[PDB]
Ligand binder design. Structure first.
Ligand SMILES: C[S@@+](CC[C@H](N)C(=O)[O-])C[C@H]1O[C@@H](n2cnc3c(N)ncnc32)[C@H](O)[C@@H]1O
Ligand SMILES: C[S@@+](CC[C@H](N)C(=O)[O-])C[C@H]1O[C@@H](n2cnc3c(N)ncnc32)[C@H](O)[C@@H]1O
Ligand SMILES: CN(C)c1nc(=O)[nH]c2cc(Cl)ccc12
Ligand SMILES: CN(C)c1nc(=O)[nH]c2cc(Cl)ccc12
Ligand SMILES: [Cl-]
Ligand SMILES: [Cl-]
Lengths: 380, 380
């Protein structure tokens, strides 16, 4: 019954993640002034460049140069020695208003509760009782390893660290009638951008002792655990200089790490009318509510929409064999307890609030008791 | 036992798909001259702009202006009336060499069979016996509806069509010990960019009669099937003008439509050393080989890598209950029959061949008998 499963995560300075954070910094800046801003902000990053491309219709007055540069500063790219500098990079803007054809078909002259979905598409929510936060241990550990790197970089413990990092954790699991039980950590990968002076052995030792041991419980690590620490051997060039980044290129790191499923939509840079984000958040809320409500040990939820139509076109449940109730019964409980129209989700999950940049690194789920992480008490 | 499942697809002129096709046109152009080109070409599209950003180390002499414009011409954006024109758009290039730190850690001075993975990451392969091509019916139908639109546009049957389109199909399934059996089509969505002159009723009638009926077997359609045809009511603005596109933003349309799982990596614009593509192709090959070999009715395969390391870090199998063999036994059969090092996958799947632009619309799988679609005869 044992098997392996692998998930990854990336740091705040990974170039795709830089784009997600900037996209969400732009969204938040708009929402601070105009709670009804229509935002679809893509970000692209390459050597010395942040480009914003997309569509925004808003009453806010946003200083894009300031918002972008402040987000880059927060990440830690503040000097040409690190490969990227918020003070001196190029910020290019190719932002237009939202298409009037989309606006008229989605929200113009519509009662908010009855606004149409901002696009068609499919979205999934997932929850697993293997951790208290109802997330896969593989991705929780991978996120915490990146967070630890950023912590040691920021506190000056490991001053040779740079913001760009990736981690990957393979866990050996057992299964019990569809639920999954972590046994041990089989393999860990860590790659992190570093300065020109530190040697490989100093980095590998610090990664094992100060990073992995500070995050992963010793009970999961043993003589057989495989460690791939700085496996490329050298990672001085990094950030956008090493690899072009784009918004919405870490959608599995943003969600469930390979577990469950994904509908394809990116979250960052989008207001609530874009169901790629709001309905995925609501589907996480449903899944977590079914697990915390004791109806199942793990569950996957699908929802789908058509542009301009408020009610979902379909809702589906996969409980992996972890409920005594059938999937048909769980679906009925979901339909009796939730209303997944985007104009209702916005109210339940408070999706006009400018907290989106906080979601754009370390996963959107299983952290900080955001509204979609607080289970709904179910009636049936 | 019945349930719904939804998948989507998009047309060749959907702005994200335009970027995938251009990224792969660039890759193919390099491979035609240098089979060992190292390519990591991202494309961004917005009104009047194609931007290439990324890293290429190659001995080829590629005319980016010509390659980009020819790809856009093929798609059909050839006039300002359509919102985008290959003859007169801006083509911007921000392409650098591959990071020497990556090159030295991945492939420099390495025997080809022993080249390291070009990155860490996880990848999944999936196959289902519900169609002969071993793909989910939901996404096969969604792809064929977009292909039909392009066919009717190109042959002049529906001259009001433009290249940007999206489709979505919800199928009602039954299940049989983990395998899935399509019963009927529950809902279809079609949205397609159109000219200023055609009215909504003419478009809705043509979409039902000339598109849906020409693709979806009548046995799946009944009095209860729901049709959302041009649900936004107006879609004159389209292509990159209506919505910024990026490479690798249709990864679920590229794969399994919500079925199975995804590791997060984009395929287009990457040579074989980027396991995001090669290992996903190999994992599809494994899954399809297990189903066509009669070992299971449907199956999901995970593989993972560390940058610079040739052998996968993990391999896992989920057979949904559709094999008499355990997942442990199937994994042993996979390890005895396949070698998922990238330097072996390249030889088995002929991944230096410049056929990538052909993969960049209508899904990478279940079409055209590419090498990863030809099952391997298994020995056990
Ligand atoms: C390996 S790069 C993708 C391939 C790359 N575009 C190329 O040209 O080969 C993906 C991510 O890996 C990380 N990376 C960059 N340089 C690296 C290095 N020298 N060693 C390890 N990881 C690296 C960064 O997080 C980067 O965004
Ligand atoms: C709805 S747009 C995404 C949201 C958009 N960025 C915004 O500013 O609201 C996503 C895709 O839908 C399609 N689309 C564009 N305009 C549309 C319209 N008027 N009606 C329906 N679909 C449309 C195109 O395929 C486009 O790439
Ligand atoms: C066989 N069934 C019931 C499913 N098979 C899957 O592969 N995944 C699913 C995902 C959802 Cl959300 C619902 C149903 C299924
Ligand atoms: C419980 N097991 C065996 C799994 N549970 C999943 O949810 N998905 C999987 C995917 C793969 Cl590739 C392998 C195993 C599993
Ligand atoms: Cl990456
Ligand atoms: Cl889209």
């Amino acid at each position: 019954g044992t098997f392996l499963f692998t998930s990854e995560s990336v740091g705040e300075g990974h170039p795709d993640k830089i784009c997600d954070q900037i996209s969400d910094a732009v969204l938040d800046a708009h929402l601070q002034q105009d709670p009804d801003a229509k935002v679809a902000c893509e970000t692209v990053a390459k050597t010395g460049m942040i480009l914003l491309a997309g569509e925004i219709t808003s009453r806010a007055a946003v200083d894009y140069q300031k918002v972008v540069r402040e987000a880059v500063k927060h990440i830690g790219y503040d000097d040409s020695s690190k490969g990227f500098d918020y003070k001196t990079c190029n910020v290019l803007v190719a932002l237009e208003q939202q298409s009037p054809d989309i606006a008229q078909g989605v929200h113009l002259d519509r009662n908010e509760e009855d606004i149409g979905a901002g696009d068609q598409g499919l979205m999934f929510g997932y929850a697993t009782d293997e951790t208290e936060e109802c997330m896969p241990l593989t991705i929780v550990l991978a996120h915490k390893l990146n967070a630890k790197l950023a912590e040691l970089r920021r506190n000056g413990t490991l001053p040779w660290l740079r913001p760009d990092s990736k981690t990957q954790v393979t866990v050996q699991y057992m299964q019990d009638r569809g639920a999954v039980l972590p046994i041990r950590v089989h393999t860990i990968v860590i790659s992190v951008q570093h300065d020109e002076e530190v040697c490989l052995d100093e980095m590998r030792d610090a990664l094992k002792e100060k990073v992995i041991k500070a995050v992963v419980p010793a009970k999961y690590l043993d003589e057989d655990t495989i460690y791939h620490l700085q496996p490329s051997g050298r990672f001085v060039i990094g950030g956008p200089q090493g690899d072009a980044g784009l918004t919405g290129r870490k959608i599995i790191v943003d969600t469930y790490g390979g577990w469950g499923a994904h509908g394809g939509g990116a979250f960052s840079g989008k207001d609530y009318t874009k169901v790629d984000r709001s309905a995925a958040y609501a589907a996480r809320w449903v899944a977590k509510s079914l697990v915390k409500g004791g109806l199942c040990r793990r569950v996957l939820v699908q929802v789908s929409y058509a542009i301009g139509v408020s009610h979902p076109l379909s809702i589906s449940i996969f409980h992996y064999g972890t409920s005594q109730k059938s999937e048909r019964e769980l679906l009925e409980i979901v339909k009796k307890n939730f209303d997944l129209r985007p104009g209702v989700i916005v109210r339940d999950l408070d999706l006009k609030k400018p907290i989106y940049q906080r979601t754009a690194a370390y996963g959107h789920f299983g952290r900080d008791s955001f509204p979609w992480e607080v289970p709904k008490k179910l009636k049936y």
